[PDB]
Design a protein around this ligand. Structure first.
Ligand SMILES: *[C@@H]1O[C@H](CO)[C@@H](O)[C@H](O)[C@H]1NC(C)=O
Ligand SMILES: *[C@@H]1O[C@H](CO)[C@@H](O)[C@H](O)[C@H]1NC(C)=O
Lengths: 36, 31
């Protein structure tokens, strides 16, 4: 919104990153360190 | 800006085009 300056969006949305952290957190609550 | 998406010339010569943060009604099939 300026003169020759733009901002590109990130490839992962915030929804996708919250999905990733909930998968890590459900893996550890439920399997310990075995899933890694 | 304008970006060109290509599968590689060793696969095909078709191409897709991204007009970055432009509303797709003021560009000048699949839009
Ligand atoms: C590139 O071309 C060569 C020969 O034309 C072929 O062997 C190779 O698989 C091609 N690479 C891809 C990614 O298609
Ligand atoms: C592009 O313009 C039309 C016409 O006002 C509008 O309906 C549409 O929402 C605009 N594009 C985006 C991504 O908002």
């Amino acid at each position: 919104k300026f003169n020759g300056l733009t901002v590109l969006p990130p490839l992962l949305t915030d929804e996708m990153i919250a999905q990733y952290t909930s998968a890590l957190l459900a893996g550890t609550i439920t399997s310990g360190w075995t899933f890694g | 800006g304008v970006s060109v998406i290509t599968p590689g010339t060793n696969t095909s010569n078709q191409v897709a085009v991204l007009y970055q943060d432009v509303n797709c009604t003021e560009v000048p099939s699949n839009v």
